[PDB]
Each structure stands twice: as C-alpha cells, then as structure tokens.
Chains A and B, each alone.
Chain A
Amino acid sequence: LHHSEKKYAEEDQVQELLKVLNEISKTTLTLDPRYIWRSLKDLSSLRNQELLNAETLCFTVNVLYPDSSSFKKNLLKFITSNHKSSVPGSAELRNSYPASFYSVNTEKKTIEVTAEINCFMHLLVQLFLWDSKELEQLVEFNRKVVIPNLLCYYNLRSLNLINAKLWFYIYLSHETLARSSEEINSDNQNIILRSTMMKFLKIASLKHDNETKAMLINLILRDFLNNGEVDSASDFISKLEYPHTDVSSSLEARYFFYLSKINAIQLDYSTANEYIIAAIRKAPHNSKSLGFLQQSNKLHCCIQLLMGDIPELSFFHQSNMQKSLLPYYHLTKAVKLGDLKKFTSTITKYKQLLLKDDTYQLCVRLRSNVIKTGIRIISLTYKKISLRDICLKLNLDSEQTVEYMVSRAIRDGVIEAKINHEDGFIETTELLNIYDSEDPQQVFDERIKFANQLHDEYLVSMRYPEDKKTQQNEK
C-alpha cells in the first residue's frame, strides 16, 4: 500500500541508472550516457513534485550514502517530518543490480561503487528544492554539502556531466532568494559563488569533456550580467573556447542570447542583431520556453531602435506576446514617426517595467535615435531642405544646433547627407543606381561563401550518426 507507491517510483529510477552503469563499465562515453540521463531527470522532476515529499527519501536511504541520507531527511523535517519507509525492506536492499552495486555484494563489500550513485542522489536534492519552490537556509545547506565532495577527488567523465547540472541549480536558487527579499549576507556570499564557477571551468579543461565545458560558460555569462560586472565579461567573451559539438540546443540558445546582452551594452548593434536571431531559432515555440522568449524579444526590439532599423508592427500581432511587449510597441511607433513627445510619454508611462528587466539603461539611449531617425526621414523626403524646417518638425532648438546633429550623425553615416553652410541647405548623397557601380560583385561573393559553409556542416554531421548505426549490431 504505502510501501508499494515509494517502491514503484524507486524501480523506475533503478532501470535508468543501471543502463548507464553498464555503459560506463565497457568504456566511459559522453553522449550515449547523457540521452538516458536526461530522460531520467524528467521522470524525477515529475515524481518528486506530484508524489509525496518522501519518495526521494526512500531512495536515499535505500542506497549506501556518505552522510547524504541524513541531510536529505533534514529538509523534510522542516515542512512536516517523514519517518516512514526507512526500516529494513527499504534499507535491507541496494536494489537490483547484477553484481556491481547489488545488495549482497555491496553490504559484503566485495565491491563498492558509490561513484555513480552519489552524483545521482545529488541530482535528486536539487530537483526537489526547486519543486518545493522554497529557498531559505535549505539553499545554503545544498551549497555546502555537494561542492567539496566533488572537489576532494577527480571525477570520471560520466560523473563530471552529472555535476554540471547541479551547478546551475545552486546558482539559480541563490539568485532567486535575493530577488524575493534582498539581504546583506546574500551579497558577501556572492563572491564565494563567483569564485567556484570560474575555478570549475579549469577543472573541466583537463578531463576533455566537451559538454561539461559549454554549460559552465553559459553560467559565467549569466552571473556577470545580474551583478552587472560587464567589464569583466567583456574580457571573457573575446577569450572563450565554446564547442558546439555535443552541446544540447538549449545550451546553444542561451549562449547566443548572453552575447547579445553584453554586445548591446558596448554599443555594438550589428553583432548583437545577428546573435539574437540565432538564439530564437534554436529555441522551441512552447510555453515551456515562454519566459526565455519574452526576455529575448525585449532585447530584439531594443537592438533595432538602437540601429535605426525599427521593428515590424506585424511581429507583435502574429505572436500572442502583445501585452508583455506593450512598452516596446509604443517605442516602435514613436521612433518611426520622429515624435519626441510620443517617445517621452512611453518611457515615463512604462518606466517601472523596463527597470525590472534591467533594460531601462538600454532604453534611454533611444532618446538620441528619435532625433537621428527624424533627420533621416527629412533627408529622404526632401532632397534639399532648409535648416529651419527641421527645427519646426522635431521640436528642436536653433539651426546651428541642427547643423551639429548632422555633422555627428554622418560620421556613422546615419543621414548620408552633407551640409552646405554658404548655400543654406542639406543635400543628401543617395541617388541610387549602384548596379552601375561595382557593389553587387562584393555582395554575391559573400552569399556564395555562406552557402559553402552550410555545405561543409552538412558533410560532417550527415555521416556521424549514420556511422554509429551501421557499426552497431541490430542484425
């Protein structure tokens, strides 16, 4: 009855572990273990949540533990203790195995392979805390317990890949506690959090684990951004090592999205634009991914107004993301029309929301782009145009001031005009017919090379999974 329910959950987990244990006894590998490990983690996340708070505890007790079973149980005491299903028949077993962590063998200590087992019991305690949706001291206790265990000995390739996924949860739970209710010791412990993450990346370099390296790089970028330590992250992004070989496509989505943030801050709007489109196309359409997409789209609108490119109105309408994106929709219309008065209203109306996402800093730089976009519209509309007419339209000062705006603005080439100060007009330089110039030559070359690069990626990838299947016995 009650023993049956905890026993069933345990038996699911055992088959998944046993599968990997067999695989790493032949020869440790990276990718074949992970696909199984990801499937197990889903089942554990769903069973911890839905089925009582003591179904983790049964497992933890059931296997041999250094001191983890007692640290697990502590967490459960606080939220109404459990004591049930820890008597023999939940502790008189070590759960079907052939002989490599089987009951008879382990107790006898003809072998002991707590190696794999310890890393999985860590995976449970992280999942279980985010399920509870709780933070306080329990976070601290999770931080303290697992980190030196993993640092008092080197890990095998399989075990390093379990412990990369624990680091993300440690980091996430620390950062949420600051956001629920800021504290003063959260600040000093953040230096500690900061130290371990970078030290980890060195540790993973020696084991030559591709998937372990990538996931830590994603963490360092995120950690700098919420601390706002962009200076240190600017040195980091020009000195990376990221592989895209074995990484999951969630990791790749995240990586590109982080770059777009730092770049936008450094006043690169052209590189930021390329990478934010990369991040979105990797990500799913699902409501699973919903919140990742909103922050991404907030940044994506912002980059375009920083360029002078001005997002589509369709883009808000085809998504059902309208209400989240409502403040960027009012900025889009404002910059396009040239109306500073419309713009100033938008940034006062929605100040609070923008400042939450910490995208308000990026938004104030847009008060400039109204003025510069306004001069580009006026140079399109009239080839030659008096200085005074600009002052009326955009609600600016003297003509001398307007002269200065254009002199600066054509250093980037935004207006693409030039001022005559003895003829008293502004004369734009565009009169297209660049197909009579040598320009398209340059362009076609680039598209051809872009095609060549997709061909190459096709070649290496097409045959590598083919090769696994043909080698593998299935006849």
Chain B
Amino acid sequence: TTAAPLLALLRENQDSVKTYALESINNVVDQLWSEISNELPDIEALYDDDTFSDREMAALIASKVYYNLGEYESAVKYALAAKDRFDIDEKSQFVETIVSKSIEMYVQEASKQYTKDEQFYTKDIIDPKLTSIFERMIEKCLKASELKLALGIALEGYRLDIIESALKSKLDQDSTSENVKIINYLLTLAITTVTNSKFRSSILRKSFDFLMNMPNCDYLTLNKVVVNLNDAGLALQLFKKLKEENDEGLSAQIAFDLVSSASQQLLEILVTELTAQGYDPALLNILSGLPTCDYYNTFLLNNKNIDIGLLNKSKSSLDGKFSLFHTAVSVANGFMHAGTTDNSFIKANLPWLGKAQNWAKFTATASLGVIHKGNLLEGKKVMAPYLPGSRASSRFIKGGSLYGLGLIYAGFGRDTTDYLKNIIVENSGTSGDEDVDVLLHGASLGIGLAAMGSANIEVYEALKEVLYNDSATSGEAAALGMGLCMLGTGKPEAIHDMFTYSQETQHGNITRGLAVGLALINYGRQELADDLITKMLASDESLLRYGGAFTIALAYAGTGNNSAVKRLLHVAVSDSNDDVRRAAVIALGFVLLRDYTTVPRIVQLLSKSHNAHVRCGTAFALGIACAGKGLQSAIDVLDPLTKDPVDFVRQAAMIALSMILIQQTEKLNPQVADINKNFLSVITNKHQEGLAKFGACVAQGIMNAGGRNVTIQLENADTGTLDTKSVVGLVMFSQFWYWFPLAHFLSLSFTPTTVIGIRGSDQAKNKYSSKPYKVDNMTRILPQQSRYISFIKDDRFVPVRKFKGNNGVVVLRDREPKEPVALIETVRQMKD
C-alpha cells in the first residue's frame, strides 16, 4: 500500500507522534521498503536529535530497508549502531536475513587484521555488537550438539579462543579414540582451506596441546603436526612423552614414519638432541634410517617378479651397437630389477654392455646402481669390480661407477662423502684430461646424491673449485652436484655464485646445469624464493627463463597457491623460445600435487594447442601430478598423444602413462593390461621411428618398476605430508631429454609400498568384502588396498596403536614374545 500517512507522523511537530512514527514504519518495513527508502534521510535526522529514546528503533529500520534495496554492506553497519533489538530475529521463521549477513562480514574483517598481529580483539575497527552476534551463532551450533559446525566458522573468523574451548571440552575421556577423531577432521580441513601459513601454524601447534593431555591416544596425530612445521622442539617433546612411558614399540613405530615424511636436515640435528636426553641406541639408528632401509630391502628380495623374456625381447629389438637404442634398454631393465642387488642383467647381457662407448656406456654403468640401489652393507661389494683401483680400461666406467655408487647410498652416504671427496679435490686442482673429465663428471653427480640434504658447506666449497676450471662436461655436472647437496637451504652465497657463472661461460651445457640446480636450492621457501624468480625471469637469457620456471616449481611445491601457477601459465604461452615453453608447463605439476583432481582440466587446454614442446610438457604435467591413484581421464587425454606425428610428444606421452599407473592390477582398472601392450606394440614394430621405440621401452621399465612392488608417493597418506625425495627425483628425471644419465634419479621417486609387520622386542566394482581372505605379512600392499585390511579381532599380533591404514612399518605387540614363531629373516641378519 501507500507509506504516506507514515511520513506525515515524522513531519508532525509534536514530540509524541515522532516517537510513534518509528514504531509504525518498522512494523510494515518489508511491505513499504521501496517507498520509505527515498525518505530514509528524514529518519536519520530523528536519530541525531536527542529527544527520542527510539534512536535505537530508528536505526533498526534502516537495516531492513537497505537489504531489500540490494546493499547488504550498509545494513550491517546500522544494525550494529542500533544496539539490541536484533537478538529477537535470530530464530524467526520469516526474517533472519539481516543477521546472517553479519556472520559473513566478520570473516572478511577477520582475515585482514590477523596478519598484522595475532591480536585483533581490542581494535576499534571491530564493533562490540559485531562480536556478540557472531559468538551467539556458534553457540547455537553447540546447543544442537554438532561441533563440526561450530569449529567450521571459527576457522574462517581467525578465532584462537573458540577453537581452543571446543577441543578442551571435547576432552573428557569417555572414549579416547573419539576424542582424537574430532581433531583429525579439523587437521584435514586446516590444510585444504587455510592457505595462509601464519594462522595455520598457530592452529596446528595448538592442536598438539589437546593430544598430549590424554594418556592413551593415537600418537600419529601428534606426529602430523610436527612434520608440517618441522620444529625439532615439538619433535623432541613428542618423544619425551613416550620416554616417560618407557615404551619401545611406539617409539620405534613413529621413528619409521618420521624419516620418510620430514626433511633430512630435521633428522640430522634431532638425534643429537635425543642423545643428550638419554635414549636407547636402537631408536637413533632408526632415525638415521639404516635399519629402515634394511626392512624395505627384505620386502623386495622376497616378492619381486621380473620378466626375463622381456629382457630378451628388448635386447633383440634394440641394438647394443646402436647408442640410442642401448641407452633405452639399459635404463628399462634397471628400473624393473630395482630395489635388490641382482646380477641377472649383468650376466645375461655380458657381451651387450661393452659394445657401446660414449655417454651411452656411461649410462650403462650407472644403471647397475639403479638395480643395486640400497643394500648398504653390500653396497661397496657389488660396485667394486668397476671402481677405480682395478678399473682403467674405460674412462666411462671409472666415472660412471661412482655415479652409480651415489644412487646406492643416496641420503645415507655420510661416510661415503669422505671417500668420493678425495677424488674430486684431486681433480679440481687440474683442468683434467678427457680421461679425467669423464671420471670427475660422475663423481660430481654421485656426491650430490650421497650428501643430499646434508647442508655440507664442505661439499659446496669442494665443487666450487670444479666450476672455476671451466671444464666442459665436468662443470655442468659440478653445478648439478652442488644443487643436490644444498637442497632446501636457501643459502645466499651459493645462489649468488651459480647465477653469475652463467654469464661467465658461453657453454650451453654449463649454463643449463646451473639454472636447474638453482631450483633445488630454493626448495620450499615459497616467496622468499621470490627475489631469485624476479632476477631469472627478467633475464635476457633463455636459459635463465628455463630455470626460473623450475624455481617456482620447487618453491611452492605441494601447495596450490594461486600466484605461483598464474606466473607459470603466462610465461608459457607468451614466449617463443621452444625450451622455455616446455619447462614452464612441467613446473605446474609440482605446484598442483596438492589437488591432482584439477590438473587434467587445466592442462586439457594446453594439449589442445598443437605445439610439440608445449604438448611435451603437458604430458609430463599429467604424469607427475597424477602419479598415484589412476584416473580414467588422465589416461584418455594422453591417448591420442601417443599418435601425434611429432615423435617427441610420443616419447613423453607413454612415459607419463607409466608414471601414472605404476603397479596397479588389470582387475583394479582394466586399462592397465591394455596400455601395457600398447607400449610393447610400438617396440615390436621396427617400422616406426627410433624416437618412438625409445619412448615405449624406457616407459616399459618404469611401468614394471620394482618388479611391480613400489609406487610413487608424491604426498604420503601416512601423515598427509609432502615427500622431499619424490620431488627431487622427478625434476632430475625431466632433464633426461637433455642428458640421458639423469633418468636414474627416478629411483628416488620410487618408495616401496608394503605393510611390514615387526616384532617390537628384538626386531624381526566397489572393492570391500564382508567375506575376508587372509593375507600374509610382508607381501605387497598398495595405498588403496590398505584401507580394507583390519587386524583380526582375535589376532596374535595386534598393533599397540590402532592402525594407520597406509603403507609402512608398524610395530606390533606379540602376546607371547618368547615362544617360537617362524620368522622372515632380515637382510641385516643374513649378513652378520
């Protein structure tokens, strides 16, 4: 109807009818909203005048009028000015509309002021009425008795107080397992919703306090927090809890988890602290990781299944006198035979290996160290017929055995570092012969591996002497070895020298070697790697633009921040430098490991553009991103890329499919058997190009890798955490197109998947079924399979803490720890 009688009351000059007007307008404010909005400034004049006690009422009218107009922003300001008379409309069946917009607005303000300082609860930028309506909303959730709703709004509002109260009161120990359950849900949502480190750090470290009050709880949950922040003090305090218990089985269990998940530098200092706490020396061997290697060795010795007719077939199809062909077969068999020191490849192909020469025979010597990766006690024994002191026949063997010895001892080679260093210092005072250059070449890649994640400034200095020689192939290798040692340090001296030596040289090999090693050095600092990215992207050189892309990749690896991916997308299309376009698209995959669901949609575009290098990096983006569980779509997008005319795309497309489906079953997705024959079919054919036969054959060895026992674990599900080793191997592997030896680094992305049960007293469609079958302990188990296994209700081996449901070593309690039981012998035990 008309609002006209109502306007007249305001205008009427007596006090009394002006008080009544605000009441009358407000009753039917949802009927006459468009009418009274024109004359809303009359009502603002009555708010000024102090002859009303309905000032609060006058303000309240304004809110309802501005919501119906369209501006929600203005309504909440004046709702807050009204003060009270806004707490009666939070549960009506008509109007809660003005209230809900307040809950939204506090979240916007909350983000902005938290970053300056954690406190913002005493700022005048936040109205006191605003805090009240927010609070009472979260209380209503608790009256309904779901805390998931209450915690969810508290995360957005950057509240430390309310999240502290809910978990505090959800401790009462009427089921310890249930208390932990509610913390798990929030830990997941923290990672996937909050991409701001400050707030997220505060929540994680706070969650620790609730876990550690309970006397019984899942301590995997305590460890999750420790690995995300990488504070050795929280790590130590966590072990300190378990030392008051004096319980061996737990301490051994979580130590197995920690070495894989956290960084190598975290472990190197952490053990020292624990030594001066006082511990058992067993735990401290396990933290170095030497036991842990032995347990994995045993799993692969026993269960590996390899194809000897395939070894013959590749040998027949691809020639040892044909140097490209010989590279493919050496690499391919090595990945298949990987994870146990087996000599079957050497004896079968004993005349075939020698027929090659140049860098291909260098590749062949280092493929031995792919097969014999690990086996620490025996590492030197199997490499000794090649090593200098009885090798002088070929310079490729002498240097390439040192490279292959580096793979065996990668991340465990602290003693080995000393031995290889003698060799380098000798050769870095010389410019070398061509005997010496090849020999020094493989020493430099190798020591990178042995001293990885050690932070040896001794090694950085050692290799700085080689760079200064200006030796052609030795200097490219020196640069790579420096980057591998100083991974995740962000040291400024090292950064400065390599970046400048690029201009000093005219060698493309060397310039490239620095550019991609600089990426390793800035691993995981994200926007403190930013100053470098600016320098490298603004550079006139194409090579520094090639490496700048990889610097983004490793810095923001495992985090899908909007900024990093934006820059990489732009660089790729807008450049007309073939090497650069390829590199930028590969880099995306690292950044988006967090959400591999999105990668096939984003890079569907890029495969659509029909440029070869662009298409090459796009296959590599799918392969790296999706290297875990298989996606039907990922397969489909790659499939015509095995048919393209350009043969460089064909190589990438099949290698990517092999990374994606690494050990799945052909009853677990029936595309596994089909795709396997597709690689084989190209090889069988000799009417195709050698580029294509090379692509299928290398991919075949990756596909069968481990004997089909290992899978690539980009992000562990043991704690939901990034794996440093997996990232490092893959970026080195993408250099295989520019130097073939570097293929072997993919072994660092193979992490063995199995559940290994251990006695904790001397250390020896719709898949699910309600009808079990029994599975033996120390057989192959996948991340996807694990969640359906649950220890029997009456079981003689029961874990001390309810099972994690993902692959790795889990200590069991044995009810009779001294009665005989058949054991599987450990590789440690077999020797000594």
Contact = CB atoms under 8 A, between A and B. Distances in A.
B1 interface: yes
Interface in A162-220: 191, 194-195, 198-199, 201-203, 205-206
A151 B95 CA distance: 10
Contacts of B68: 201-202, 205
A372 B587 CA distance: 77
A231 interface: yes
B100 interface: yes
B475 to A, nearest CB: 53
A357 interface: no
Interface stretch (A234-242, A301-309, A338-346, A424-432): A234-242
B732 to A, nearest CB: 39
A267 to B, nearest CB: 20
Interface in A349-395: none
Interface in B1-39: 1-4, 28, 30-35, 37-38
A205 B65 CA distance: 13
B1 A236 contact: no
B70 A202 contact: no
Contact of A198 (B31, B93, B95): B31
Interface in A221-257: 229, 231-232, 235-236, 239, 241
A232 B70 contact: no
A475 to B, nearest CB: 12
A450 to B, nearest CB: 27
A153 interface: yes
A152 interface: yes
Contact of B30 (A151, A198, A235, A236): A198
A154 interface: yes
Interface in B64-86: 64, 67-70
Interface string B91-105: 001111100100000
Contacts of A201: 68
B31 A194 contact: yes
Nearest to B101: A206
A22 B278 CA distance: 64
- Residue among B1, B94, B100 having the largest count of chain A Cβ atoms under 10 Å: B1
Contact of A232 (B2, B30, B37, B100): B2
A235 B36 CA distance: 9
Q: Size band of the B side of the interface?
A: 20 to 34
Contacts of B35: 232, 235-236
B689 to A, nearest CB: 33
Contact of B38 (A153, A202, A235, A241): A235
Q: Size band of the A side of the interface?
A: 20 to 34
A69 B94 CA distance: 26
Nearest to B38: A235
Given A198-B33, A205-B68, A236-B34, A229 B1 contact: yes
Given A198-B33, A239-B37, A191 B1 contact: yes
A203 B1 contact: no
Contact of A205 (B31, B37, B93, B97): B97
Contacts of B93: 151-154
- Residue among A198, A201, A206, A231 having the largest count of chain B Cβ atoms under 10 Å: A198
Nearest to A152: B93
A154 B91 CA distance: 11
B76 to A, nearest CB: 14
A191 B32 CA distance: 12
A178 to B, nearest CB: 16
B70 A241 contact: yes
A235 B35 CA distance: 6
A239 B70 CA distance: 9
Interface string A130-168: 000000000000000000000111100000000000000
A153 B94 CA distance: 8
A151 B2 contact: no
Given A205-B97, A206-B97, A206-B100, A229 B2 contact: yes
Given A151-B94, A194-B1, A202 B67 contact: yes
Nearest to A206: B97
Contact of B33 (A191, A194, A202, A206): A202
Nearest to A148: B93
Given A153-B93, A154-B93, A202-B95, A235 B70 contact: no
A195 B1 CA distance: 7
Contacts of B33: 198, 202
A212 to B, nearest CB: 14
A258 B70 CA distance: 22
Contacts of B32: 198, 232
Contacts of B37: 235, 239
B94 A203 contact: yes
12 contacts: A151-B93, A151-B94, A194-B1, A194-B31, A195-B31, A198-B31, A205-B67, A206-B97, A229-B1, A231-B4, A232-B35, A235-B35
Interchain residue pairs A-B with the least CB separation, the first 7: A198-B31, A199-B30, A206-B97, A236-B34, A239-B34, A202-B30, A194-B1
Interface of B: 1-4, 28, 30-35, 37-38, 64, 67-70, 93-97, 100
Interface of A: 151-154, 191, 194-195, 198-199, 201-203, 205-206, 229, 231-232, 235-236, 239, 241
Given A199-B31, A202-B68, A231-B4, 14 more contacts: A154-B93, A191-B1, A195-B1, A195-B28, A195-B31, A198-B32, A198-B33, A201-B68, A202-B33, A202-B95, A203-B94, A205-B68, A232-B35, A235-B37
